[PDB]
Amino acid sequence: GSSGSSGDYYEILGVSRGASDEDLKKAYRRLALKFHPDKNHAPGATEAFKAIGTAYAVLSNPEKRKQYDQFGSGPSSG
């Protein structure tokens, strides 16, 4: 394997590398609902929701996914 503390979309959601849409969705949801600002009471959790999506929105798209699987986010920093 390779060092962690990297941050991968698939991981953020909690799936394997190459998960289909349905899979990405199901998981993404189960999470959002838990980190939702309407369901959750504490912000700490909500703040995460923002991240989760960002990952899903990618794997959800064929261009954003295929590109992420082939190369990946990269050295891109925030």
Side-chain angles (χ1 to χ4, degrees):
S2 281
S3 56
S5 180
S6 297
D8 282 327
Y9 305 144
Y10 288 114
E11 275 162 38
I12 294 171
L13 306 161
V15 304
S16 280
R17 273 271 285 287
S20 34
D21 310 318
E22 210 79 283
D23 288 42
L24 295 158
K25 201 166 57 71
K26 283 198 199 178
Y28 173 49
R29 282 210 84 73
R30 173 156 203 168
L31 301 177
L33 281 289
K34 171 207 164 157
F35 298 102
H36 210 260
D38 286 284
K39 291 209 156 283
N40 202 307
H41 87 256
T46 316
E47 280 184 308
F49 179 43
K50 281 163 77 90
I52 319 196
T54 283
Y56 173 83
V58 178
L59 314 184
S60 82
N61 282 326
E63 194 159 317
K64 311 209 90 66
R65 173 188 185 192
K66 70 89 87 165
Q67 84 176 16
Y68 175 77
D69 275 304
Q70 280 273 29
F71 303 84
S73 67
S76 176
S77 292

Short mmCIF file of all heavy atoms in Angstrom, two decimals:
data_model
loop_
_atom_site.label_atom_id
_atom_site.label_comp_id
_atom_site.label_asym_id
_atom_site.label_seq_id
_atom_site.Cartn_x
_atom_site.Cartn_y
_atom_site.Cartn_z
N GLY A 1 0.81 -1.21 0.00
CA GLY A 1 0.00 0.00 0.00
C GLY A 1 0.84 1.26 0.00
O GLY A 1 2.06 1.20 -0.17
N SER A 2 0.19 2.40 0.19
CA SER A 2 0.89 3.69 0.20
C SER A 2 0.45 4.53 1.40
O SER A 2 -0.68 4.42 1.87
CB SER A 2 0.63 4.45 -1.10
OG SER A 2 1.43 3.95 -2.15
N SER A 3 1.36 5.37 1.88
CA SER A 3 1.07 6.23 3.02
C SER A 3 -0.35 6.79 2.94
O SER A 3 -0.90 6.97 1.85
CB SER A 3 2.07 7.38 3.09
OG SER A 3 2.08 8.12 1.89
N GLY A 4 -0.95 7.05 4.10
CA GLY A 4 -2.30 7.59 4.13
C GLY A 4 -2.32 9.10 4.15
O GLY A 4 -1.62 9.75 3.38
N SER A 5 -3.14 9.67 5.03
CA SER A 5 -3.26 11.12 5.15
C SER A 5 -3.18 11.78 3.78
O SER A 5 -2.52 12.80 3.60
CB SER A 5 -2.16 11.67 6.06
OG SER A 5 -2.26 13.08 6.18
N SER A 6 -3.87 11.19 2.80
CA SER A 6 -3.88 11.71 1.44
C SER A 6 -5.23 12.35 1.11
O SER A 6 -5.30 13.51 0.73
CB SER A 6 -3.56 10.60 0.44
OG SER A 6 -2.26 10.08 0.65
N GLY A 7 -6.29 11.56 1.26
CA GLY A 7 -7.62 12.06 0.97
C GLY A 7 -8.10 11.68 -0.42
O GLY A 7 -7.76 12.35 -1.40
N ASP A 8 -8.88 10.61 -0.50
CA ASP A 8 -9.40 10.15 -1.78
C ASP A 8 -10.93 10.14 -1.77
O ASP A 8 -11.56 9.79 -0.78
CB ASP A 8 -8.88 8.74 -2.08
CG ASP A 8 -7.45 8.76 -2.59
OD1 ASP A 8 -7.08 9.73 -3.28
OD2 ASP A 8 -6.71 7.79 -2.31
N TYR A 9 -11.52 10.54 -2.90
CA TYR A 9 -12.97 10.59 -3.02
C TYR A 9 -13.60 9.28 -2.56
O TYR A 9 -14.36 9.25 -1.59
CB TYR A 9 -13.37 10.88 -4.47
CG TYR A 9 -12.74 12.13 -5.03
CD1 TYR A 9 -12.35 12.20 -6.37
CD2 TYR A 9 -12.54 13.25 -4.23
CE1 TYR A 9 -11.77 13.34 -6.88
CE2 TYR A 9 -11.96 14.39 -4.74
CZ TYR A 9 -11.58 14.44 -6.07
OH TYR A 9 -11.01 15.58 -6.58
N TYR A 10 -13.28 8.19 -3.26
CA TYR A 10 -13.81 6.88 -2.92
C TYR A 10 -13.79 6.65 -1.42
O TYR A 10 -14.78 6.22 -0.83
CB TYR A 10 -13.01 5.79 -3.63
CG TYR A 10 -13.25 5.72 -5.12
CD1 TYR A 10 -12.24 6.02 -6.02
CD2 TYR A 10 -14.50 5.36 -5.62
CE1 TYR A 10 -12.46 5.96 -7.39
CE2 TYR A 10 -14.72 5.30 -6.99
CZ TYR A 10 -13.70 5.60 -7.86
OH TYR A 10 -13.92 5.54 -9.22
N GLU A 11 -12.65 6.95 -0.80
CA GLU A 11 -12.50 6.77 0.64
C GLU A 11 -13.48 7.67 1.41
O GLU A 11 -14.26 7.19 2.23
CB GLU A 11 -11.06 7.09 1.07
CG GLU A 11 -10.11 5.92 0.92
CD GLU A 11 -8.66 6.34 0.93
OE1 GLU A 11 -8.31 7.27 1.68
OE2 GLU A 11 -7.86 5.75 0.17
N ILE A 12 -13.43 8.96 1.12
CA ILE A 12 -14.31 9.92 1.78
C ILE A 12 -15.72 9.37 1.92
O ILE A 12 -16.37 9.54 2.95
CB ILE A 12 -14.36 11.25 1.01
CG1 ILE A 12 -13.00 11.95 1.04
CG2 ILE A 12 -15.44 12.16 1.59
CD1 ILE A 12 -12.91 13.15 0.12
N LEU A 13 -16.19 8.69 0.88
CA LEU A 13 -17.53 8.11 0.88
C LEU A 13 -17.53 6.77 1.61
O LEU A 13 -18.46 6.46 2.36
CB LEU A 13 -18.03 7.92 -0.55
CG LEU A 13 -18.01 9.17 -1.44
CD1 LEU A 13 -18.07 8.78 -2.91
CD2 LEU A 13 -19.16 10.09 -1.08
N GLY A 14 -16.49 5.98 1.40
CA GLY A 14 -16.39 4.68 2.05
C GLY A 14 -16.69 3.54 1.10
O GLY A 14 -17.51 2.67 1.41
N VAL A 15 -16.04 3.54 -0.05
CA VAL A 15 -16.24 2.49 -1.05
C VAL A 15 -14.92 2.07 -1.68
O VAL A 15 -13.86 2.58 -1.33
CB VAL A 15 -17.21 2.95 -2.15
CG1 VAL A 15 -18.53 3.40 -1.55
CG2 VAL A 15 -16.59 4.06 -2.98
N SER A 16 -15.00 1.13 -2.63
CA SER A 16 -13.81 0.64 -3.31
C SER A 16 -13.54 1.45 -4.58
O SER A 16 -14.42 2.15 -5.08
CB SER A 16 -13.97 -0.84 -3.66
OG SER A 16 -13.71 -1.66 -2.54
N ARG A 17 -12.32 1.35 -5.09
CA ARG A 17 -11.93 2.07 -6.29
C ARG A 17 -12.56 1.44 -7.53
O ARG A 17 -12.11 0.41 -8.03
CB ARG A 17 -10.40 2.07 -6.44
CG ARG A 17 -9.73 3.23 -5.71
CD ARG A 17 -9.61 4.45 -6.60
NE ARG A 17 -8.56 4.30 -7.60
CZ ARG A 17 -7.26 4.35 -7.32
NH1 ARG A 17 -6.86 4.53 -6.07
NH2 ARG A 17 -6.36 4.20 -8.28
N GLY A 18 -13.63 2.07 -8.03
CA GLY A 18 -14.31 1.56 -9.20
C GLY A 18 -15.78 1.30 -8.95
O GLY A 18 -16.44 0.61 -9.72
N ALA A 19 -16.30 1.86 -7.86
CA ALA A 19 -17.70 1.69 -7.51
C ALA A 19 -18.61 2.38 -8.52
O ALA A 19 -18.33 3.49 -8.97
CB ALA A 19 -17.97 2.22 -6.11
N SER A 20 -19.71 1.72 -8.86
CA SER A 20 -20.66 2.27 -9.82
C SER A 20 -21.44 3.44 -9.22
O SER A 20 -21.22 3.80 -8.06
CB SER A 20 -21.64 1.18 -10.29
OG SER A 20 -21.92 0.27 -9.24
N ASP A 21 -22.33 4.02 -10.01
CA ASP A 21 -23.13 5.14 -9.55
C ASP A 21 -23.98 4.75 -8.35
O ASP A 21 -23.82 5.29 -7.25
CB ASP A 21 -24.03 5.65 -10.68
CG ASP A 21 -23.27 5.89 -11.97
OD1 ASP A 21 -22.15 6.45 -11.89
OD2 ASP A 21 -23.78 5.53 -13.04
N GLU A 22 -24.90 3.81 -8.55
CA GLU A 22 -25.77 3.35 -7.48
C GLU A 22 -25.00 3.20 -6.18
O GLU A 22 -25.45 3.67 -5.13
CB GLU A 22 -26.42 2.01 -7.86
CG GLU A 22 -27.79 1.80 -7.25
CD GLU A 22 -28.88 2.54 -8.00
OE1 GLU A 22 -28.99 3.77 -7.82
OE2 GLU A 22 -29.63 1.88 -8.75
N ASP A 23 -23.85 2.55 -6.24
CA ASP A 23 -23.02 2.34 -5.06
C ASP A 23 -22.59 3.68 -4.46
O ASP A 23 -22.78 3.91 -3.26
CB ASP A 23 -21.78 1.52 -5.42
CG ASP A 23 -22.11 0.07 -5.71
OD1 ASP A 23 -23.13 -0.18 -6.39
OD2 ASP A 23 -21.36 -0.82 -5.25
N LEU A 24 -22.03 4.55 -5.29
CA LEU A 24 -21.58 5.86 -4.83
C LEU A 24 -22.72 6.63 -4.18
O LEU A 24 -22.55 7.25 -3.13
CB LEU A 24 -21.01 6.66 -6.00
CG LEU A 24 -19.74 6.10 -6.64
CD1 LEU A 24 -19.58 6.63 -8.06
CD2 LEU A 24 -18.52 6.45 -5.80
N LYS A 25 -23.89 6.58 -4.80
CA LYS A 25 -25.06 7.28 -4.28
C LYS A 25 -25.45 6.73 -2.92
O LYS A 25 -25.36 7.43 -1.91
CB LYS A 25 -26.24 7.14 -5.26
CG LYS A 25 -27.31 8.19 -5.07
CD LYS A 25 -28.27 8.22 -6.25
CE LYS A 25 -28.93 6.87 -6.47
NZ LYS A 25 -29.91 6.55 -5.39
N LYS A 26 -25.89 5.48 -2.89
CA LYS A 26 -26.30 4.83 -1.64
C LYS A 26 -25.40 5.26 -0.49
O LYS A 26 -25.86 5.82 0.50
CB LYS A 26 -26.26 3.31 -1.79
CG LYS A 26 -27.44 2.74 -2.57
CD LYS A 26 -27.60 1.25 -2.31
CE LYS A 26 -28.44 0.60 -3.40
NZ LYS A 26 -28.57 -0.87 -3.19
N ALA A 27 -24.10 5.01 -0.63
CA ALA A 27 -23.13 5.38 0.39
C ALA A 27 -23.18 6.87 0.69
O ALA A 27 -23.36 7.28 1.83
CB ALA A 27 -21.73 4.96 -0.03
N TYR A 28 -23.02 7.68 -0.36
CA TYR A 28 -23.04 9.13 -0.21
C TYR A 28 -24.22 9.57 0.65
O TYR A 28 -24.06 10.38 1.57
CB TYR A 28 -23.12 9.80 -1.59
CG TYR A 28 -23.32 11.30 -1.52
CD1 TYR A 28 -22.52 12.08 -0.70
CD2 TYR A 28 -24.30 11.92 -2.28
CE1 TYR A 28 -22.70 13.45 -0.63
CE2 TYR A 28 -24.48 13.29 -2.22
CZ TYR A 28 -23.68 14.05 -1.39
OH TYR A 28 -23.85 15.41 -1.33
N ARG A 29 -25.40 9.04 0.35
CA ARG A 29 -26.60 9.38 1.10
C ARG A 29 -26.45 9.00 2.57
O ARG A 29 -26.44 9.87 3.45
CB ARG A 29 -27.82 8.67 0.50
CG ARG A 29 -28.34 9.32 -0.77
CD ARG A 29 -29.84 9.12 -0.92
NE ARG A 29 -30.61 10.11 -0.18
CZ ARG A 29 -30.71 11.38 -0.54
NH1 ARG A 29 -30.10 11.82 -1.63
NH2 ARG A 29 -31.43 12.22 0.20
N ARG A 30 -26.35 7.70 2.84
CA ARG A 30 -26.20 7.21 4.20
C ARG A 30 -25.33 8.15 5.03
O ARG A 30 -25.54 8.31 6.23
CB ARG A 30 -25.59 5.81 4.20
CG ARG A 30 -25.25 5.29 5.59
CD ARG A 30 -25.21 3.77 5.62
NE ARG A 30 -25.44 3.24 6.96
CZ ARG A 30 -25.68 1.96 7.22
NH1 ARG A 30 -25.73 1.08 6.23
NH2 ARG A 30 -25.87 1.56 8.47
N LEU A 31 -24.36 8.78 4.38
CA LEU A 31 -23.46 9.71 5.06
C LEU A 31 -24.13 11.07 5.24
O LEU A 31 -24.34 11.52 6.37
CB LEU A 31 -22.17 9.87 4.26
CG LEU A 31 -21.36 8.59 4.03
CD1 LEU A 31 -20.14 8.87 3.17
CD2 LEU A 31 -20.96 7.96 5.36
N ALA A 32 -24.45 11.72 4.13
CA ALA A 32 -25.09 13.03 4.17
C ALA A 32 -26.17 13.08 5.24
O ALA A 32 -26.20 13.99 6.07
CB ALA A 32 -25.68 13.37 2.81
N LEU A 33 -27.07 12.10 5.22
CA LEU A 33 -28.15 12.03 6.19
C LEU A 33 -27.62 12.10 7.61
O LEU A 33 -28.26 12.65 8.51
CB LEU A 33 -28.95 10.74 6.00
CG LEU A 33 -29.96 10.74 4.84
CD1 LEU A 33 -31.14 11.63 5.17
CD2 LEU A 33 -29.29 11.18 3.55
N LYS A 34 -26.43 11.54 7.82
CA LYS A 34 -25.80 11.54 9.14
C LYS A 34 -25.08 12.86 9.39
O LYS A 34 -24.96 13.30 10.54
CB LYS A 34 -24.81 10.38 9.25
CG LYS A 34 -23.96 10.43 10.51
CD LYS A 34 -22.63 9.72 10.31
CE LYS A 34 -21.64 10.09 11.40
NZ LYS A 34 -20.59 9.05 11.57
N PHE A 35 -24.60 13.49 8.32
CA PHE A 35 -23.89 14.76 8.43
C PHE A 35 -24.74 15.90 7.88
O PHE A 35 -24.21 16.92 7.43
CB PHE A 35 -22.56 14.69 7.69
CG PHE A 35 -21.62 13.65 8.24
CD1 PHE A 35 -21.47 12.43 7.60
CD2 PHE A 35 -20.90 13.89 9.40
CE1 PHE A 35 -20.60 11.47 8.11
CE2 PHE A 35 -20.03 12.94 9.90
CZ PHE A 35 -19.89 11.73 9.26
N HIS A 36 -26.06 15.72 7.90
CA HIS A 36 -26.97 16.74 7.40
C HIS A 36 -27.24 17.80 8.46
O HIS A 36 -27.38 17.51 9.65
CB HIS A 36 -28.29 16.10 6.96
CG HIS A 36 -28.97 16.83 5.85
ND1 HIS A 36 -30.02 17.69 6.04
CD2 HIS A 36 -28.74 16.81 4.51
CE1 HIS A 36 -30.41 18.18 4.88
NE2 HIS A 36 -29.65 17.67 3.94
N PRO A 37 -27.32 19.07 8.03
CA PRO A 37 -27.57 20.20 8.93
C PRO A 37 -28.99 20.20 9.48
O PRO A 37 -29.29 20.86 10.47
CB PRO A 37 -27.35 21.42 8.03
CG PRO A 37 -27.61 20.93 6.65
CD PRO A 37 -27.17 19.49 6.63
N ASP A 38 -29.88 19.45 8.82
CA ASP A 38 -31.27 19.36 9.25
C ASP A 38 -31.46 18.22 10.25
O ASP A 38 -32.24 18.34 11.20
CB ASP A 38 -32.18 19.15 8.04
CG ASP A 38 -32.35 20.41 7.22
OD1 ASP A 38 -33.10 21.31 7.65
OD2 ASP A 38 -31.73 20.51 6.13
N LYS A 39 -30.75 17.12 10.03
CA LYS A 39 -30.84 15.96 10.91
C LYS A 39 -29.88 16.10 12.08
O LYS A 39 -30.27 15.91 13.24
CB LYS A 39 -30.53 14.68 10.13
CG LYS A 39 -31.60 14.32 9.11
CD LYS A 39 -31.68 12.82 8.89
CE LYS A 39 -33.05 12.40 8.38
NZ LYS A 39 -34.07 12.40 9.46
N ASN A 40 -28.63 16.43 11.79
CA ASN A 40 -27.61 16.59 12.82
C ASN A 40 -27.85 17.87 13.62
O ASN A 40 -28.43 18.83 13.11
CB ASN A 40 -26.22 16.61 12.20
CG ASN A 40 -25.13 16.24 13.19
OD1 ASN A 40 -25.04 16.82 14.27
ND2 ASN A 40 -24.31 15.26 12.83
N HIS A 41 -27.39 17.87 14.87
CA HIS A 41 -27.55 19.03 15.74
C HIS A 41 -26.25 19.83 15.82
O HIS A 41 -26.27 21.06 15.89
CB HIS A 41 -27.99 18.59 17.13
CG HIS A 41 -26.85 18.25 18.04
ND1 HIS A 41 -26.49 16.95 18.35
CD2 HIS A 41 -25.97 19.04 18.70
CE1 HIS A 41 -25.45 16.96 19.16
NE2 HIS A 41 -25.11 18.22 19.39
N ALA A 42 -25.13 19.12 15.82
CA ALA A 42 -23.82 19.76 15.89
C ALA A 42 -23.29 20.08 14.50
O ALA A 42 -23.49 19.34 13.54
CB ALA A 42 -22.84 18.87 16.65
N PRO A 43 -22.59 21.22 14.39
CA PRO A 43 -22.01 21.67 13.12
C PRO A 43 -20.85 20.79 12.67
O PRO A 43 -20.76 20.40 11.50
CB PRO A 43 -21.52 23.09 13.43
CG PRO A 43 -21.28 23.09 14.90
CD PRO A 43 -22.31 22.16 15.49
N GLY A 44 -19.95 20.48 13.60
CA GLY A 44 -18.80 19.66 13.28
C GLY A 44 -19.12 18.60 12.25
O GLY A 44 -18.34 18.36 11.33
N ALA A 45 -20.28 17.96 12.39
CA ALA A 45 -20.70 16.92 11.46
C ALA A 45 -21.08 17.51 10.11
O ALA A 45 -20.63 17.05 9.07
CB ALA A 45 -21.86 16.13 12.05
N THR A 46 -21.93 18.54 10.14
CA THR A 46 -22.38 19.19 8.92
C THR A 46 -21.20 19.63 8.07
O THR A 46 -21.13 19.31 6.88
CB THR A 46 -23.25 20.42 9.24
OG1 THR A 46 -24.18 20.11 10.28
CG2 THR A 46 -24.00 20.88 8.00
N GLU A 47 -20.26 20.35 8.68
CA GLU A 47 -19.08 20.83 7.97
C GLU A 47 -18.54 19.76 7.02
O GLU A 47 -18.11 20.06 5.91
CB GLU A 47 -18.00 21.24 8.96
CG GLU A 47 -18.21 22.62 9.56
CD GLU A 47 -17.08 23.04 10.48
OE1 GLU A 47 -16.74 22.27 11.39
OE2 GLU A 47 -16.54 24.15 10.28
N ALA A 48 -18.58 18.51 7.47
CA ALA A 48 -18.10 17.39 6.67
C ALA A 48 -18.93 17.23 5.41
O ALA A 48 -18.40 17.08 4.31
CB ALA A 48 -18.11 16.11 7.49
N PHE A 49 -20.25 17.24 5.57
CA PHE A 49 -21.16 17.09 4.44
C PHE A 49 -20.60 17.77 3.19
O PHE A 49 -20.56 17.18 2.11
CB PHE A 49 -22.53 17.68 4.78
CG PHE A 49 -23.53 17.58 3.66
CD1 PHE A 49 -23.63 16.41 2.91
CD2 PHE A 49 -24.36 18.64 3.35
CE1 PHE A 49 -24.54 16.31 1.88
CE2 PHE A 49 -25.27 18.55 2.32
CZ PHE A 49 -25.37 17.38 1.58
N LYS A 50 -20.16 19.01 3.35
CA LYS A 50 -19.60 19.77 2.24
C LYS A 50 -18.56 18.95 1.49
O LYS A 50 -18.59 18.85 0.27
CB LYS A 50 -18.98 21.07 2.74
CG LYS A 50 -20.00 22.17 3.01
CD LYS A 50 -19.42 23.27 3.89
CE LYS A 50 -18.49 24.18 3.11
NZ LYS A 50 -19.23 25.32 2.50
N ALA A 51 -17.63 18.36 2.24
CA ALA A 51 -16.57 17.55 1.65
C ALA A 51 -17.15 16.33 0.94
O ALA A 51 -16.96 16.15 -0.26
CB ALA A 51 -15.58 17.12 2.72
N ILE A 52 -17.86 15.50 1.70
CA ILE A 52 -18.47 14.30 1.14
C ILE A 52 -18.97 14.54 -0.28
O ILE A 52 -18.50 13.92 -1.23
CB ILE A 52 -19.64 13.80 2.01
CG1 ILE A 52 -19.29 13.92 3.49
CG2 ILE A 52 -20.00 12.36 1.65
CD1 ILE A 52 -20.20 13.12 4.40
N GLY A 53 -19.93 15.45 -0.41
CA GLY A 53 -20.48 15.77 -1.72
C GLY A 53 -19.40 15.98 -2.77
O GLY A 53 -19.36 15.27 -3.77
N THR A 54 -18.53 16.95 -2.53
CA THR A 54 -17.45 17.26 -3.46
C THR A 54 -16.90 15.99 -4.09
O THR A 54 -16.63 15.94 -5.29
CB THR A 54 -16.31 18.02 -2.76
OG1 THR A 54 -16.68 19.38 -2.57
CG2 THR A 54 -15.03 17.94 -3.59
N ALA A 55 -16.72 14.95 -3.27
CA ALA A 55 -16.20 13.68 -3.75
C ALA A 55 -17.22 12.96 -4.63
O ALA A 55 -16.90 12.50 -5.73
CB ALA A 55 -15.79 12.80 -2.58
N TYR A 56 -18.45 12.87 -4.14
CA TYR A 56 -19.52 12.21 -4.88
C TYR A 56 -19.74 12.88 -6.23
O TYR A 56 -19.72 12.22 -7.27
CB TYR A 56 -20.82 12.23 -4.07
CG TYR A 56 -22.01 11.71 -4.83
CD1 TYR A 56 -22.27 10.34 -4.92
CD2 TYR A 56 -22.89 12.58 -5.47
CE1 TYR A 56 -23.36 9.87 -5.61
CE2 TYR A 56 -23.98 12.11 -6.17
CZ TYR A 56 -24.22 10.75 -6.23
OH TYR A 56 -25.31 10.28 -6.93
N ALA A 57 -19.96 14.19 -6.21
CA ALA A 57 -20.18 14.94 -7.44
C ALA A 57 -19.18 14.56 -8.52
O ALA A 57 -19.47 14.64 -9.71
CB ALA A 57 -20.11 16.44 -7.15
N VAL A 58 -18.00 14.13 -8.09
CA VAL A 58 -16.95 13.72 -9.02
C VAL A 58 -17.19 12.31 -9.54
O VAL A 58 -17.50 12.11 -10.71
CB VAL A 58 -15.56 13.79 -8.36
CG1 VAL A 58 -14.48 13.33 -9.33
CG2 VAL A 58 -15.27 15.20 -7.86
N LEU A 59 -17.04 11.33 -8.65
CA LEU A 59 -17.24 9.93 -9.02
C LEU A 59 -18.58 9.74 -9.72
O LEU A 59 -18.75 8.81 -10.51
CB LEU A 59 -17.17 9.04 -7.78
CG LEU A 59 -16.01 9.31 -6.82
CD1 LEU A 59 -16.00 8.30 -5.69
CD2 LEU A 59 -14.69 9.29 -7.56
N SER A 60 -19.52 10.63 -9.44
CA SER A 60 -20.85 10.56 -10.05
C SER A 60 -20.77 10.84 -11.55
O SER A 60 -21.55 10.29 -12.33
CB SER A 60 -21.79 11.55 -9.38
OG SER A 60 -21.62 12.86 -9.90
N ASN A 61 -19.84 11.70 -11.94
CA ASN A 61 -19.66 12.05 -13.34
C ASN A 61 -18.65 11.13 -14.01
O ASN A 61 -17.67 10.69 -13.41
CB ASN A 61 -19.20 13.51 -13.47
CG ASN A 61 -20.35 14.49 -13.28
OD1 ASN A 61 -21.48 14.21 -13.67
ND2 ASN A 61 -20.05 15.64 -12.70
N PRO A 62 -18.89 10.82 -15.30
CA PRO A 62 -18.01 9.95 -16.08
C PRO A 62 -16.67 10.61 -16.38
O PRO A 62 -15.63 9.94 -16.40
CB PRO A 62 -18.80 9.72 -17.37
CG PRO A 62 -19.69 10.91 -17.49
CD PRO A 62 -20.04 11.31 -16.08
N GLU A 63 -16.69 11.91 -16.63
CA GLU A 63 -15.47 12.65 -16.93
C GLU A 63 -14.68 12.95 -15.66
O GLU A 63 -13.45 12.87 -15.65
CB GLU A 63 -15.81 13.96 -17.65
CG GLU A 63 -14.61 14.63 -18.30
CD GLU A 63 -15.01 15.61 -19.39
OE1 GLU A 63 -15.90 15.27 -20.19
OE2 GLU A 63 -14.43 16.71 -19.44
N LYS A 64 -15.39 13.29 -14.59
CA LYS A 64 -14.76 13.60 -13.32
C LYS A 64 -14.27 12.32 -12.64
O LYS A 64 -13.33 12.36 -11.84
CB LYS A 64 -15.74 14.33 -12.40
CG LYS A 64 -16.44 15.50 -13.07
CD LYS A 64 -16.81 16.58 -12.06
CE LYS A 64 -15.69 17.59 -11.89
NZ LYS A 64 -15.47 18.39 -13.13
N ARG A 65 -14.91 11.20 -12.95
CA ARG A 65 -14.53 9.92 -12.37
C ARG A 65 -13.37 9.29 -13.14
O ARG A 65 -12.29 9.09 -12.59
CB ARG A 65 -15.73 8.96 -12.37
CG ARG A 65 -15.38 7.55 -11.93
CD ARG A 65 -16.55 6.60 -12.14
NE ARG A 65 -16.27 5.27 -11.61
CZ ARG A 65 -17.02 4.20 -11.87
NH1 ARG A 65 -18.09 4.32 -12.65
NH2 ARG A 65 -16.70 3.02 -11.35
N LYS A 66 -13.61 8.99 -14.41
CA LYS A 66 -12.58 8.39 -15.26
C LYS A 66 -11.26 9.13 -15.12
O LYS A 66 -10.19 8.52 -15.09
CB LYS A 66 -13.03 8.39 -16.72
CG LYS A 66 -13.07 9.77 -17.34
CD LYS A 66 -11.73 10.15 -17.96
CE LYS A 66 -11.63 9.66 -19.40
NZ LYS A 66 -10.50 10.31 -20.12
N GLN A 67 -11.33 10.45 -15.04
CA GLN A 67 -10.14 11.28 -14.91
C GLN A 67 -9.51 11.11 -13.53
O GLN A 67 -8.29 11.19 -13.37
CB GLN A 67 -10.48 12.75 -15.14
CG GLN A 67 -11.01 13.46 -13.91
CD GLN A 67 -11.25 14.94 -14.14
OE1 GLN A 67 -11.31 15.40 -15.28
NE2 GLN A 67 -11.38 15.70 -13.06
N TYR A 68 -10.35 10.88 -12.52
CA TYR A 68 -9.88 10.70 -11.16
C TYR A 68 -9.24 9.32 -10.98
O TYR A 68 -8.27 9.17 -10.23
CB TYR A 68 -11.04 10.87 -10.17
CG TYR A 68 -10.65 10.59 -8.73
CD1 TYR A 68 -9.93 11.52 -7.99
CD2 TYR A 68 -11.01 9.40 -8.11
CE1 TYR A 68 -9.58 11.28 -6.68
CE2 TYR A 68 -10.66 9.15 -6.80
CZ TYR A 68 -9.94 10.09 -6.09
OH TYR A 68 -9.59 9.83 -4.78
N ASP A 69 -9.79 8.33 -11.66
CA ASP A 69 -9.28 6.97 -11.57
C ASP A 69 -7.99 6.83 -12.37
O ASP A 69 -7.04 6.18 -11.93
CB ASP A 69 -10.32 5.97 -12.09
CG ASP A 69 -11.31 5.57 -11.01
OD1 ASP A 69 -10.87 5.08 -9.95
OD2 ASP A 69 -12.53 5.73 -11.24
N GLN A 70 -7.96 7.43 -13.56
CA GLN A 70 -6.79 7.37 -14.42
C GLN A 70 -5.61 8.09 -13.78
O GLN A 70 -4.56 7.50 -13.54
CB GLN A 70 -7.10 7.97 -15.79
CG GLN A 70 -7.84 7.03 -16.72
CD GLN A 70 -6.91 6.14 -17.52
OE1 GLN A 70 -5.81 5.82 -17.07
NE2 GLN A 70 -7.35 5.75 -18.71
N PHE A 71 -5.79 9.38 -13.51
CA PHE A 71 -4.74 10.19 -12.91
C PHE A 71 -5.03 10.45 -11.43
O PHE A 71 -4.32 9.98 -10.55
CB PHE A 71 -4.59 11.52 -13.65
CG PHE A 71 -4.29 11.35 -15.12
CD1 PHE A 71 -5.32 11.15 -16.03
CD2 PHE A 71 -2.99 11.40 -15.59
CE1 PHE A 71 -5.05 11.00 -17.37
CE2 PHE A 71 -2.72 11.25 -16.93
CZ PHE A 71 -3.75 11.05 -17.83
N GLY A 72 -6.10 11.21 -11.18
CA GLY A 72 -6.47 11.52 -9.81
C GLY A 72 -6.29 12.99 -9.48
O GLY A 72 -5.59 13.71 -10.20
N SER A 73 -6.91 13.44 -8.40
CA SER A 73 -6.82 14.83 -7.98
C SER A 73 -5.43 15.39 -8.27
O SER A 73 -5.28 16.38 -8.98
CB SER A 73 -7.13 14.96 -6.49
OG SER A 73 -6.13 14.33 -5.70
N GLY A 74 -4.41 14.75 -7.71
CA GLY A 74 -3.04 15.20 -7.91
C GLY A 74 -2.52 16.03 -6.76
O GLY A 74 -3.06 16.00 -5.65
N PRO A 75 -1.45 16.79 -7.01
CA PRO A 75 -0.83 17.65 -5.99
C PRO A 75 -1.71 18.84 -5.62
O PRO A 75 -1.34 19.66 -4.78
CB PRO A 75 0.46 18.12 -6.66
CG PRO A 75 0.18 18.04 -8.12
CD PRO A 75 -0.75 16.88 -8.30
N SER A 76 -2.87 18.93 -6.26
CA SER A 76 -3.80 20.02 -6.00
C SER A 76 -3.99 20.23 -4.50
O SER A 76 -4.33 19.30 -3.77
CB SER A 76 -5.15 19.73 -6.66
OG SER A 76 -6.10 20.75 -6.35
N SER A 77 -3.77 21.46 -4.04
CA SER A 77 -3.91 21.79 -2.63
C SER A 77 -5.01 22.82 -2.42
O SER A 77 -5.42 23.51 -3.36
CB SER A 77 -2.59 22.32 -2.08
OG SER A 77 -1.60 21.30 -2.04
N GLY A 78 -5.50 22.92 -1.19
CA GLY A 78 -6.55 23.87 -0.88
C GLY A 78 -6.10 24.94 0.10
O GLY A 78 -5.82 24.65 1.26
#
